[PDB]
Design a protein around this nucleic acid. Structure first.
Ligand code: ZN
Ligand code: ZN
Ligand code: ZN
Ligand code: ZN
Lengths: 76, 77
DNA sequence: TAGAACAGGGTGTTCT
DNA sequence: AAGAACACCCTGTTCT
């Protein structure tokens, strides 16, 4: 009951390999299967917090990936 | 000139005083008539264009004001 | 944990 | 022009 590793909201467990909130869990699944090519409108370093995480899915997705989120994580 | 001065998409006319596209017309009306408590996740200079204008309402609204958008542009002869 | 599904919000086009 | 309104999409929650 701590804090999302992606946005620093309240984490609701470990999803796809990483301690993340529920909003980040579902955002990640959607980004991976939708195959979206997001583009940042700043510098590829946007603030991803509870308030701003929706602004830049490019940087949010990148953070997910860099925290090591992965769909075949449980299979491991 | 026929490009939107807020996002560079194709402008459809002069709205609220400024050459803009229909999306920036209604975005601006919505932002002025309501709350626009928006937060930039970058450094307040996000690139606002057709493909990214959705990412940052803080910056898209600053750009509208900066271009001179105002609701009473019409009644302002 | 993982996913469907719903419900709310923002967007951008049509307005036979 | 200006504005209503509709469909679409994205997000985040509740439920399984
Ligand atoms: Zn999160
Ligand atoms: Zn970004
Ligand atoms: Zn525009
Ligand atoms: Zn911004």
């Amino acid at each position: 009951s701590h804090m999302c590793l992606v946005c620093s909201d309240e984490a609701s467990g470990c999803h796809y390999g990483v301690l993340t909130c529920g909003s980040c869990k579902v955002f990640f699944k959607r980004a991976v299967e939708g195959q979206h090519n997001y583009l940042c409108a700043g510098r590829n370093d946007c603030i991803i917090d509870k308030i701003r995480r929706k602004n830049c899915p490019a940087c949010r997705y990148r953070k997910c990936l860099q925290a090591g989120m992965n769909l075949e994580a449980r299979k491991t």
